[PDB]
Amino acid sequence: DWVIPPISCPENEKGEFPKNLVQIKSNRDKETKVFYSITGQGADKPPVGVFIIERETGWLKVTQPLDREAIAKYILYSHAVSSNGEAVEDPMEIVITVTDQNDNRPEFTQEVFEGSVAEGAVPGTSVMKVSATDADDDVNTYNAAIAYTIVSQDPELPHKNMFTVNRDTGVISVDTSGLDRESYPTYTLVVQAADLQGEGLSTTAKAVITVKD
Amino acid sequence: DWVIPPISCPENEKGEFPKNLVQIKSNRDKETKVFYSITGQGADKPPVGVFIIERETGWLKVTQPLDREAIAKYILYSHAVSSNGEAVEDPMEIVITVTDQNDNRPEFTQEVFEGSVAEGAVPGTSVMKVSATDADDDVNTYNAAIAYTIVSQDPELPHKNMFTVNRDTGVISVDTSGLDRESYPTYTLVVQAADLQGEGLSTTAKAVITVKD
Numbered sequence: 001d002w003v004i005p006p007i008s009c010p011e012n013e014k015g016e017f018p019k020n021l022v023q024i025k026s027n028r029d030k031e032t033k034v035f036y037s038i039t040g041q042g043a044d045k046p047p048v049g050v051f052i053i054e055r056e057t058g059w060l061k062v063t064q065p066l067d068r069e070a071i072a073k074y075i076l077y078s079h080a081v082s083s084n085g086e087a088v089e090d091p092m093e094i095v096i097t098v099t100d101q102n103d104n105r106p107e108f109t110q111e112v113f114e115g116s117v118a119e120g121a122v123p124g125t126s127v128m129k130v131s132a133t134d135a136d137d138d139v140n141t142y143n144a145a146i147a148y149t150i151v152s153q154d155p156e157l158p159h160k161n162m163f164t165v166n167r168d169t170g171v172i173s174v175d176t177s178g179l180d181r182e183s184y185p186t187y188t189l190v191v192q193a194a195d196l197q198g199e200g201l202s203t204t205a206k207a208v209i210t211v212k213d
Numbered sequence: 214d215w216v217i218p219p220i221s222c223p224e225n226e227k228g229e230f231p232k233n234l235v236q237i238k239s240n241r242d243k244e245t246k247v248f249y250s251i252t253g254q255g256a257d258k259p260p261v262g263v264f265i266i267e268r269e270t271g272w273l274k275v276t277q278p279l280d281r282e283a284i285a286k287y288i289l290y291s292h293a294v295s296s297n298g299e300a301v302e303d304p305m306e307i308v309i310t311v312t313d314q315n316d317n318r319p320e321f322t323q324e325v326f327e328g329s330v331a332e333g334a335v336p337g338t339s340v341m342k343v344s345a346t347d348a349d350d351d352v353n354t355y356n357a358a359i360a361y362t363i364v365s366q367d368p369e370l371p372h373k374n375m376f377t378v379n380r381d382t383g384v385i386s387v388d389t390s391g392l393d394r395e396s397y398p399t400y401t402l403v404v405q406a407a408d409l410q411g412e413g414l415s416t417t418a419k420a421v422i423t424v425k426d
């Protein structure tokens with residue numbers, strides 16, 4: 001039973017429906033009459049009706065917007081039957097992949113993350129980890145590929161950039177030194193998560209670092 | 214035989230060969246080991262060896278650069294057998310479309326075109342036609358959409374731009390008044406054709422216009 005190269009249909013389509021994807025067709029339709037149908041989840045089983053097939057020509061259509069983040073791949077079967085009811089083909093297994101769009105913003109595991117460092121640790125010691133998630137397609141695109149930046153430090157002394165964040169790991173480390181509890185005892189960092197490798201959709205959270213003796 | 218939706222492969226690929234197109238696979242391989250082959254012009258018949266299928270995996274592969282302007286479509290059949298060589302599927306018909314690149318420069322029908330106009334003619338009167346052809350795919354791309362321009366006018370009197378060319382059609386026109394046979398009896402224009410609607414590959418030729426009483 002052949003399985004068909006995947007038919008791509010992007011999520012969140014808009015406008016008039018139904019829309020044509022792709023024609024599936026027996027080359028025996030000059031020998032005898034051929035009537036097409038499809039079965040499976042997305043066709044005659046839940047969700048019913050997302051895809052339909054023009055009985056007579058074999059144009060496969062989609063009848064509504066899709067959401068990759070709810071169903072990413074549909075498997076159906078097509079059938080080719082003649083007037084006398086005989087099968088003109090074995091069923092063909094039909095694979096449809098929902099193609100991703102970047103329609104989910106990253107989200108931080110917490111709105112405020114807490115750590116602490118020692119006064120005289122050392123430019124590149126580990127303070128804490130911040131983390132986001134993105135629900136988009138981490139396998140075939142960058143839409144869920146998260147770059148952590150630092151947006152602002154408070155207060156800005158002794159110098160701006162007392163800290164850095166590793167843009168992939170979200171691990172926060174000491175960048176320059178002169179950390180002095182008694183001059184400046186807590187810092188409030190605004191941290192950013194952005195997909196498209198830094199360029200895309202973004203969100204912010206807070207990291208509150210307590211300077212210790 | 215089912216005919217599957219066409220697989221696109223662009224002309225003029227560069228780099229490492231063979232390149233993978235698409236996995237053509239039987240779902241009957243849970244039961245028994247399956248072995249795949251292909252046939253047709255471009256596989257086992259001339260041009261032999263353009264496409265191959267990997268026997269155990271069913272990856273379909275193209276083995277060299279294609280040229281849309283020599284062959285635009287291939288038709289193959291895939292086949293599926295078990296260790297003993299018996300068939301576990303009917304064959305599947307496989308269509309392959311070669312997609313276009315802008316690899317053809319427009320050519321003028323002539324190197325020098327000839328035309329004429331009456332001294333008295335009013336701005337807007339049509340003088341003559343220049344015309345070019347492009348061999349790229351004028352049905353699905355812009356690689357053949359030609360735009361025309363006048364590059365230079367000799368002589369430049371009584372004004373620059375005695376003439377104009379309609380930039381979709383190649384119709385050359387009287388633009389401003391003052392044509393007088395007895396002061397300037399011919400003009401030589403350099404005309405240009407460029408595809409991608411003017412932004413792409415270009416060529417030039419000459420238009421010679423005799424001003425008549």
Ligand SMILES: [Ca+2]
Nearest residue numbers: 067068069103
């Ligand atoms: Ca979605």
Ligand SMILES: [Ca+2]
Nearest residue numbers: 101102103136
């Ligand atoms: Ca998405």
Ligand SMILES: [Ca+2]
Nearest residue numbers: 104136143195
């Ligand atoms: Ca995203």
Ligand SMILES: [Ca+2]
Nearest residue numbers: 119180181182
């Ligand atoms: Ca101190």
Ligand SMILES: [Ca+2]
Nearest residue numbers: 280281282316
């Ligand atoms: Ca070519």
Ligand SMILES: [Ca+2]
Nearest residue numbers: 313314316349
């Ligand atoms: Ca071409």
Ligand SMILES: [Ca+2]
Nearest residue numbers: 317349356408
């Ligand atoms: Ca061209």
Ligand SMILES: [Ca+2]
Nearest residue numbers: 332393394395
């Ligand atoms: Ca005159």
